[PDB]
Design an enzyme around this catalytic site. Structure first.
Site, mmCIF file in Angstrom:
data_model
loop_
_atom_site.group_PDB
_atom_site.id
_atom_site.type_symbol
_atom_site.label_atom_id
_atom_site.label_comp_id
_atom_site.label_asym_id
_atom_site.label_seq_id
_atom_site.Cartn_x
_atom_site.Cartn_y
_atom_site.Cartn_z
ATOM 1 C CD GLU A 39 -2.049 58.900 10.751
ATOM 2 O OE1 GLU A 39 -1.568 59.207 9.637
ATOM 3 O OE2 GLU A 39 -1.962 57.739 11.210
ATOM 4 C CG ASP B 243 -1.606 55.806 5.652
ATOM 5 O OD1 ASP B 243 -1.313 56.901 5.140
ATOM 6 O OD2 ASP B 243 -1.948 55.724 6.856
ATOM 7 C CG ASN B 244 1.238 55.236 7.629
ATOM 8 O OD1 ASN B 244 0.430 54.377 7.962
ATOM 9 N ND2 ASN B 244 1.149 56.497 8.019
ATOM 10 C CE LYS C 157 8.584 50.174 10.623
ATOM 11 N NZ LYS C 157 8.376 49.227 11.742
ATOM 12 C CG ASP D 151 -3.520 52.496 7.245
ATOM 13 O OD1 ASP D 151 -2.345 52.788 7.566
ATOM 14 O OD2 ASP D 151 -4.527 53.074 7.696
HETATM 15 N N1 LIG Z 1 -0.892 41.509 9.765
HETATM 16 C C1 LIG Z 1 -2.003 42.170 10.084
HETATM 17 N N2 LIG Z 1 -3.222 41.729 9.604
HETATM 18 C C2 LIG Z 1 -4.386 42.392 9.916
HETATM 19 N N3 LIG Z 1 -4.341 43.515 10.717
HETATM 20 C C3 LIG Z 1 -3.148 43.958 11.187
HETATM 21 C C4 LIG Z 1 -1.963 43.309 10.893
HETATM 22 N N4 LIG Z 1 -0.960 43.994 11.502
HETATM 23 C C5 LIG Z 1 -1.477 45.054 12.173
HETATM 24 N N5 LIG Z 1 -2.847 45.022 11.992
HETATM 25 C C6 LIG Z 1 -3.883 45.958 12.463
HETATM 26 O O1 LIG Z 1 -3.843 47.064 11.572
HETATM 27 C C7 LIG Z 1 -4.325 48.226 12.203
HETATM 28 C C8 LIG Z 1 -3.444 49.400 11.777
HETATM 29 S S1 LIG Z 1 -4.127 51.029 12.164
HETATM 30 C C9 LIG Z 1 -5.298 51.013 10.772
HETATM 31 C C10 LIG Z 1 -6.025 52.347 10.636
HETATM 32 C C11 LIG Z 1 -7.185 52.341 9.638
HETATM 33 N N6 LIG Z 1 -6.730 51.806 8.353
HETATM 34 C C12 LIG Z 1 -7.826 53.724 9.524
HETATM 35 O O2 LIG Z 1 -7.353 54.581 8.762
HETATM 36 O O3 LIG Z 1 -8.838 54.015 10.185
HETATM 37 C C13 LIG Z 1 -4.273 47.960 13.701
HETATM 38 O O4 LIG Z 1 -5.603 48.055 14.191
HETATM 39 C C14 LIG Z 1 -3.693 46.562 13.847
HETATM 40 O O5 LIG Z 1 -4.355 45.778 14.816
HETATM 41 O O1 LIG Z 2 1.391 51.002 12.665
HETATM 42 C C1 LIG Z 2 0.741 51.761 11.928
HETATM 43 N N1 LIG Z 2 -0.233 51.135 11.119
HETATM 44 C C2 LIG Z 2 -1.044 51.872 10.270
HETATM 45 N N2 LIG Z 2 -1.021 53.181 10.162
HETATM 46 C C3 LIG Z 2 -0.085 53.863 10.971
HETATM 47 C C4 LIG Z 2 -0.082 55.264 10.876
HETATM 48 O O2 LIG Z 2 -0.917 55.890 10.023
HETATM 49 C C5 LIG Z 2 0.810 56.047 11.628
HETATM 50 C C6 LIG Z 2 1.724 55.436 12.497
HETATM 51 C C7 LIG Z 2 2.612 56.351 13.248
HETATM 52 C C8 LIG Z 2 3.392 57.304 12.582
HETATM 53 C C9 LIG Z 2 4.199 58.183 13.300
HETATM 54 C C10 LIG Z 2 4.222 58.124 14.712
HETATM 55 F F1 LIG Z 2 5.008 58.994 15.405
HETATM 56 C C11 LIG Z 2 3.430 57.187 15.375
HETATM 57 C C12 LIG Z 2 2.622 56.319 14.647
HETATM 58 C C13 LIG Z 2 1.726 54.031 12.625
HETATM 59 CL CL1 LIG Z 2 2.868 53.339 13.689
HETATM 60 C C14 LIG Z 2 0.823 53.243 11.862
HETATM 61 MG MG LIG Z 3 -1.680 54.544 8.596
#
Ligand SMILES: Nc1ncnc2c1ncn2[C@@H]1O[C@H](CSCC[C@H](N)C(=O)O)[C@@H](O)[C@H]1O
Ligand SMILES: O=c1[nH]cnc2c(O)cc(-c3ccc(F)cc3)c(Cl)c12
Ligand SMILES: [Mg+2]
Length: 214
Positions: free
Chosen positions: A198, A168-169, A143, A140
């Site tokens: 979410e 996720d996603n 992508k 998560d």
């Molecule tokens: N390559 C990477 N390694 C570790 N963290 C990363 C990453 N790329 C993005 N991230 C981190 O991944 C997070 C994605 S949002 C994660 C939401 C969390 N899993 C929840 O549900 O509460 C961001 O905080 C971003 O800083």
């Molecule tokens: O980058 C993401 N990392 C981990 N979880 C993510 C998530 O749950 C949702 C989205 C998201 C989806 C639609 C939107 F319009 C804006 C943001 C992102 Cl962008 C991330």
């Molecule tokens: Mg997510």
């Protein structure tokens, strides 16, 4: 001067019941619905994650992407005694919020925050964190990393027969390459869980991909 993440923590600190993980989750959900959206996994997809944790009862879980700690709270609160969560977070400010969120919920003993990029940390897991194999991985973070981090986990020998990957996603923003991989590969048995993005009415989903090994 608060970042969005500090605003979330401030809202939890004054509204949630200290030491109460469920209360912490409810407060974050409330903030993101009523005040300001944030990319927590959220309650709808959260129910699916809860079901997965309960069904497989993993003793060692790896989370990629911690953010504010919402998903770490969700998972840690369901771990059996003796079980642990490792969460990787590339952004040190988010790693700080996550740590405070876990402390507030009283779950700090079940969770270890690893600071840095998943691509850098995964090859260190065995030596530096005494990991044998992982029981579960929650993907998560971002992508573009889902496919390469999955292959990296395999290359490092961190997955075993039965390891559950939960991504996720996979619909929004969408991860077609990861899906092409787990769904096309004999190394994985897959199940799609349709849900909602979410705090939105937009369709999104989780993919559960269970490693079958070689
Ligand atoms: N390559 C990477 N390694 C570790 N963290 C990363 C990453 N790329 C993005 N991230 C981190 O991944 C997070 C994605 S949002 C994660 C939401 C969390 N899993 C929840 O549900 O509460 C961001 O905080 C971003 O800083
Ligand atoms: O980058 C993401 N990392 C981990 N979880 C993510 C998530 O749950 C949702 C989205 C998201 C989806 C639609 C939107 F319009 C804006 C943001 C992102 Cl962008 C991330
Ligand atoms: Mg997510």
């Amino acid at each position: 001067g608060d970042t969005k993440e500090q605003r979330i923590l401030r809202y939890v600190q004054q509204n949630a019941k200290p030491g109460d993980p469920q209360s912490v989750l409810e407060a974050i959900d409330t903030y993101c619905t009523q005040k300001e959206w944030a990319m927590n996994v959220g309650d709808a997809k959260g129910q699916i994650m809860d079901a997965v944790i309960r069904e497989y009862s993993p003793s060692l879980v790896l989370e990629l992407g911690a953010y504010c700690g919402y998903s770490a709270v969700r998972m840690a609160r369901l771990l059996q005694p003796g079980a642990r969560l490792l969460t990787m977070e590339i952004n040190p400010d988010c790693a700080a919020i996550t740590q405070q969120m876990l402390n507030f919920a009283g779950l700090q003993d079940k969770v270890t925050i690893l600071n840095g990029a998943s691509q850098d940390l995964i090859p260190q897991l065995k030596k530096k964190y005494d990991v044998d194999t992982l029981d579960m991985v929650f993907l998560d973070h971002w992508k573009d990393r889902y496919l390469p981090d999955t292959l990296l986990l395999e290359k490092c020998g961190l997955l075993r027969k039965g390891t559950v990957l939960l991504a996720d996603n996979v619909i929004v923003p969408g991860t077609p390459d990861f899906l092409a991989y787990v769904r096309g590969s004999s190394s994985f048995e897959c199940t799609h869980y349709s849900s909602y993005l979410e705090y939105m009415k937009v369709v999104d989903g989780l993919e559960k991909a269970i490693y079958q090994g070689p």
